Amino acid sequence: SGFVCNTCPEKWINFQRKCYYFGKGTKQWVHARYACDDMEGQLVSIHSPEEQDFLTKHASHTGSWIGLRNLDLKGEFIWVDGSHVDYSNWAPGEPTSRSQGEDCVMMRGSGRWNAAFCDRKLGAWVCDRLATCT
C-alpha cells in the first residue's frame, strides 16, 4: 500500500497525496500566503479528519494561518486553492460567532478553526502542495 507520488521538497513533510510546510515567524494572512507562494505551495486546505490529525500533530502550539477565506460578502468560506469545503473543524460557535469583516481563518493549537482578522500577526502558517511524481 501507499501512494505512487510521494516525493516532497526538503523541509517539507509528506502525508498521503500532499507535502506540508510548517512555517514560523510573524506574518499577516496575506504575507503568509506570499511565503507559501514563493515556495511554490499554497496556504493549506484541509479535507479530512486524517489530514487534520496529521496537522494538529505537527503544527505550532500557538495559532497558524490556513488557506480558508470569506470573500463573497455572504460569509461563505472557501479554500484559496480552489478546493471546495467538504470537511470542517470549526471551534464551538464558529464561524458565525465572528465579526463583520473577519474574512480569514486560523488553526488553534488544538487544531480547531476560528475566523480572524486578516491583519492579525500570527507566529505560524502552513503551506501544502501535491507530492511530486518520480
Numbering used by the authors: 156 to 289
From the paper:
To verify that the principal site is indeed the location of Ca2+ binding to derCD23 in solution, and to confirm the exact nature of the interaction, several single point mutations in derCD23 were generated: conserved residues were mutated within the principal (E249A and D270A) and auxiliary (S252A and D258A) calcium-binding sites, along with the highly conserved Asn-269 residue (N269A and N269D). As expected, the two principal binding site derCD23 mutants, E249A and D270A, were unable to bind Ca2+. D258A (auxiliary) and D270A (principal site) crystallized differently, and in all eight and seven molecules within the asymmetric unit, respectively, Pro-250 is trans. The crystal structures of the derCD23 principal and auxiliary Ca2+-binding site mutants were determined (but not those of N269A or N269D mutants). No major conformational changes were observed in either the principal or auxiliary Ca2+-binding sites upon introduction of the point mutations that could inadvertently affect the binding of Ca2+, with the exception of D258A.
